[PDB]
């Protein structure tokens, strides 16, 4: 599972999207972190089989 932040928070409302743009570092570190988690897990699947 990967969350698509900047549209999880928020629901897609433009003022809330701008208040996310204040926090544009944290969301990048979220989806960066999960994509890293899926590559580690996917290499566990690949290396397993």
């Amino acid at each position: 599972v990967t969350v698509d932040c900047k549209q999880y928070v928020c629901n897609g409302f433009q003022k809330c999207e701008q208040l996310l743009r204040e926090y544009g570092q944290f969301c990048s570190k979220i989806n960066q972190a999960l994509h890293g988690a899926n590559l580690r897990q996917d290499d566990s699947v690949r290396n397993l089989f």
Binding site: D4, Q7, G12, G24, S28, N31, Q32, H35, R46
Partner: protein, 707 residues
């Protein structure tokens, strides 16, 4: 005010020929931020070889912008005649966040003379001119493009060797062809190269003088000049505004050869610029002296996050518009122009609201207008279920002195549909405004009137005019300033605070109007009531000329039994997609005629959370709702060959459309169909078996090599 030189002494203006079709050309020069087109350097600080993601005002990748071209005028062999211009003066644009301008890009190439399309010439750079301001309208003959009050004018002069910036009232002049005269078509500026651009003696006021023929400049607060060295080099110009004034940017002084824009002026213009136009210039050449003048291009600015690549010497030679597409996002959402090769999830693509269903006549404010508003501690309560309200109607009767809300706004409380609107009204003096507060521990909140803290609330102070006569005034304003009982003596005494939506326990002993300021009331308690005494004290404020009242509104804000709707086919069935707006709650859903689970007497159904899944309200059927449609898109980046490929999550080969127009976010500004083993992909081709296997190794089993 500043002396800007004499008015024109001419009694007429030069005639102007508007022929827009001669200026309608397709010469595309879109923004390419890969080459750092249209980049203002950051104001706050400056940087070395560092790359970064940065949010600021930028044009968007691929924006073609607005193109403008200036032309030689009409002429015989010997004599310049009518000016020759496009329709730019009537095309007033919204300033918004400002804009950047690509200047001189075609210089040195061969192009048409415009007024004589069959004649080609070497293209020379020409500088743009702008009119900006706060208020616009029409000239006396009805034509658009008139700027009112102080207007900012940016006007190059001296055959492209200076920029003039000035802020004046523009008084239209009344001679023939002038904007307040007969035979007006458009204003314009001009210069006459045979006499204005002779070697060593450029006329530094030629364009200014031409402008002064169409307008008298009045009450100028400033007129600045900026010298420009003559060349045919491409340049960028930018303009923004803050509370500090209007900021001008150029590549000329700091990055002449590279194009980065830096601030060179702040103009003391503090009235917000809302509008601008391009001032047409025409060159009064004779036929044998006709040149082609480089088109310029205006691109609007907006707040965007870019990934900025700074060289060692500090300049920006590379950027990425992160929101352009998922591939750029991946590149960026990482702070690198390069994003290692893999699958990167970019957000939806949520569907557009269409068929906004509203469900709910006229709310009865009657008994408020007829009689005497009681005292705050005897506040009368009007309840509202299942009706339409015009509240701005009600608040147009009274003169309103204060409007504050809690957990809502006055704007919002007029608009939204609330099933229960409780209206509490009473007499109340404006002098005691500081005591009628949701954040107050005065006597009013303690002993008289308290709103709920769990619902959104509003508090209104008003004044009945004279015009309103069915509302009668009482002897004075009265309120309770003490409500307490000591006890059978015991060890303690307490002061009683009413729960929201209740009267004071002292209303049984305090008269409906207090006879005199400071009167006190007592009542011995029965052993069953607790014994001891009940005690109160009343205060008065002198009656006013016009009666003054207090209104307390409470909205629910409670999911069921919600009906109330505002007063103003499509707002009913069959809106079988997003959106609805029920009186009870907002939301975005896809209604379907489902079966058959509910209560059916009150009219929602939830599923163990705040959400409603979802039928009711229709009359009478089961329109069960769902959550919003979102296409869970992604990006298949492959940085080795630099070929993105947008994959959708699990739907659909049949439901999507290319550059889909039913959905919100690409993300966000711009986008850019084969499946169907996993989901839908915007990438050819079908299997193609079987290799190798390796990364970048997409989902269920497309192993997707490149190219």
């Amino acid at each position: 005010y500043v002396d800007v030189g004499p008015d024109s002494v001419k009694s007429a203006c030069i005639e102007v020929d508007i022929q827009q079709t001669f200026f309608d050309k397709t010469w595309p020069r879109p923004i390419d931020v890969s080459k750092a087109d249209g980049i203002i350097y950051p104001q706050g600080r400056t940087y070395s070889n560092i790359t970064i993601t940065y949010q600021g005002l930028f044009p968007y990748q691929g924006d073609h912008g607005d193109m403008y071209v200036y032309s030689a005028g009409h002429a015989t062999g010997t004599t310049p005649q009518k000016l020759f211009v496009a329709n730019y003066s009537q095309d007033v644009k919204q300033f918004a966040n400002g804009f950047v301008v690509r200047i001189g890009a075609a210089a040195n190439s061969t192009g048409t003379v415009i007024i004589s399309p069959s004649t080609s010439a070497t293209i020379r750079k020409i500088y743009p001119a702008f009119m900006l301001g706060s208020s616009v309208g029409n000239f006396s003959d009805g034509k658009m493009g008139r700027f009112f009050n102080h207007t900012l004018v940016l006007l190059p002069d001296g055959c492209g060797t200076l920029l003039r910036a000035f802020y004046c009232i523009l008084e239209p002049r009344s001679g023939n062809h002038c904007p307040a005269g007969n035979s007006y078509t458009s204003f314009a500026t001009y210069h006459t190269p045979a006499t204005d651009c002779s070697d060593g003696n450029y006329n530094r006021n030629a364009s200014l003088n031409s402008f002064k023929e169409y307008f008298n400049l009045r009450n100028c607060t400033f007129m600045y000049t900026y010298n420009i060295t003559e060349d045919e080099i491409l340049e960028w110009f930018g303009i923004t505004q803050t509370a500090q004034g209007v900021h001008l940017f150029s590549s000329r002084y700091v990055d002449l050869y590279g194009g980065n824009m830096f601030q060179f002026a702040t103009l003391p213009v503090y009235d917000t610029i809302k509008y601008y136009s391009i001032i047409p210039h025409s060159i009064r050449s004779i036929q044998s002296d006709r040149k082609a003048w480089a088109a310029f291009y205006v691109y609007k600015l907006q707040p965007l996050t870019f990934l900025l690549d700074f060289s060692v010497d500090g300049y920006i030679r590379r950027a990425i518009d992160c929101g352009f597409n998922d591939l750029s996002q991946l590149h960026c959402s990482y702070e690198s122009f390069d994003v290692e090769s893999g699958v990167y999830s970019v957000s939806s693509f949520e569907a557009k609201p269409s068929g906004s269903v509203v469900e709910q006549v006229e709310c009865d404010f009657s008994p408020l207008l007829s009689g005497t508003p009681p005292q705050v501690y005897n506040f009368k309560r009007l309840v509202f279920t299942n009706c339409n309200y015009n509240l701005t109607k009600l608040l147009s009767l009274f003169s309103v002195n204060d409007f504050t809300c809690s957990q809502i706004s006055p704007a919002a409380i007029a608009s939204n549909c609330y099933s229960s609107l409780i209206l509490d009204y009473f007499s109340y003096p404006l002098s005691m405004k500081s005591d009628l507060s949701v954040s107050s521990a005065g006597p009013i909140s303690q002993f008289n009137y308290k709103q709920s803290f769990s619902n959104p609330t509003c508090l209104i102070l008003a004044t009945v005019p004279h015009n309103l006569t069915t509302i009668t005034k009482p002897l004075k304003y009265s309120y309770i300033n003490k409500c307490s009982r000591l006890l059978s003596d015991d060890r303690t005494e307490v002061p009683q605070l009413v729960n929201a939506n209740q009267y004071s326990p002292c209303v049984s002993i305090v008269p409906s109007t207090v006879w005199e300021d400071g009167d006190y009331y007592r009542k011995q308690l029965s052993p069953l009531e607790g014994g001891g005494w009940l005690v109160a004290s009343g205060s008065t404020v002198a009656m006013t000329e016009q009666l003054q009242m207090g209104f307390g509104i409470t909205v629910q804000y409670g999911t069921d039994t919600n009906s109330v709707c505002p007063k103003l086919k499509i707002a009913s069935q069959l809106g079988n997609c997003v959106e609805y707006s029920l009186y009870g709650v907002s939301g975005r859903g896809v209604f379907q005629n489902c079966t058959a689970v509910g209560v059916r007497q009150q009219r929602f159904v939830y599923d163990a959370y705040q959400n409603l899944v979802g039928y009711y309200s229709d009359d009478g059927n089961y329109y069960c709702l769902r959550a919003c449609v979102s296409v869970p898109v992604s990006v298949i980046y492959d940085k080795e060959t630099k070929t993105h490929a947008t994959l959708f999550g699990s739907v659909a080969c049949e439901h999507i459309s290319s550059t889909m127009s039913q959905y919100s976010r690409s993300t966000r500004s711009m986008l850019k169909p084969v499946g169907c083993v996993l989901g839908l992909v915007n990438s050819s081709l079908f299997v193609e078996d079987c290799k190798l296997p390796l990364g970048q190794s997409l989902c269920a089993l497309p192993d997707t090599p490149s190219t």
